[PDB]
């Protein structure tokens, strides 16, 4: 089986920049190599066919070249919407193998998060469980530290993070931290705080509430 | 329209069988090579199988050989993936795709989600996240299986400033997610905010009003 080794696994580039993405085939595959773009939630779209031919309706920014067993996908000028995983594929011999992919992120200005905290609803507590939700809205870059403190004790292994895909129009991120407790655990403490550290804040931002 | 339409996915028990269908429009499959490609959630593209219906000749990844059978009926313009001995590993969006001769694959279907799990269907519990002049509010969609779930706001009327987070698998083996929206604070008793939650797999439509 032929391996397509794709470099790099991830990259961050500003709009306007040239981007180079590499596939090394472990054997001769002639030109029978193609490049696909896959946006979040979507099927891949063909960009470059037969190693160097631009597929219909695809912007001229996208180009493909071959040097023996090495294949190169180039974006001339990024664009905020080019946020996607790029894969190459070989159709020379079965199995018709895919690269591991390259996640392209758009680099932009630092933007601090708006921080909001939401106490558990009455309804949930009556269900017998307590979920506390901390929102970090519209920030760049992705790297953000969220810490939970109940009665000013740092918590661990009781929060789950989830983060939107980069906005295709303004390249920001939003993130949720959700602290989940028993009703009894929720009602034996008074103070609930998420403390946010991010490059756009001069100092950590804490949003908190007291039950009641 | 040149198009591929996958069907037959859904939630299935480990050890069971599932027949996927790939219905071709705008071309006859006799003259094309038809492929199955899968994506485990968050992972890359793995090529699975291919068939040339005009010659009955078949290709399989070792990962599925013996267990899976790719076939086609040119009189139904449809290719099939018969999946047997299903494993958790086989949980993936299954895409079918078309290639001509030794040319690269050009058209992809939308994909069909196959979830392999012994865990029962479970509708979400929906709970409010009660609220310069911008306020945040949302709903926690908690304790559902399997994926996916849709959230809209104000029956799709409110789209601007909405972030539906990706689901996270909690330790109980149920998913949970928050949809959040940033609105003007002036409208907290003016405008009512409802989130519409559709969990099609459990046939659960839930509408929850959120207000202070």
Residue numbers in the entry:
A (entry chain A): 1 to 212
B (entry chain B): 1 to 131, 138 to 218
Publication passage describing the model:
One intracellular protein that is frequently mutated in cancer is isocitrate dehydrogenase 2 (IDH2), somatic mutations of which can contribute to the development of AML via production of the oncometabolite 2-hydroxyglutarate (2HG). Here, we describe the identification of a neoantigen-specific TCRm antibody targeting the IDH2R140Q mutant peptide in complex with a common HLA allele (HLA-B*07:02), the structural basis of its specificity, and its functional activity in a CAR T-cell format.
To assess if there was conformational change in the 2Q1-Fab upon pHLA binding, we determined the structure of the 2Q1-Fab in free form. There were four copies of the 2Q1-Fab in the asymmetric unit with alignment of the peptide Cα atoms yielding pairwise rmsd values of 0.25–0.32 Å. Overall, the structures of the four copies are similar, with the only striking difference being the conformation of CDR-H3. This is likely a result of the conformational flexibility inherent in this loop. Structural alignment of the Cα atoms of the unbound 2Q1-Fab molecule with the IDH2R140Q-HLA-B*07:02 bound 2Q1-Fab display pairwise rmsd values between 1.2 and 1.4 Å. This superposition revealed a rmsd of 1.3 Å displacement (maximum rmsd of 3.6 Å) in the light chain, while the outer strands of the β-sheet of the heavy variable chain expand to accommodate binding to the HLA-B*07:02 with an rmsd of 1.5 Å (maximum rmsd of 7.4 Å). All three CDRs of the 2Q1 heavy chain exhibited significant conformational changes. Specifically, binding to the C-terminal end of HLA-B*07:02 α1 and the N-terminal end of α2 induces conformational changes in CDR-H1 and -H2, respectively, while binding to the C-terminal end of the IDH2 peptide induces a conformational shift in CDR-H3, thus optimizing binding to pHLA.
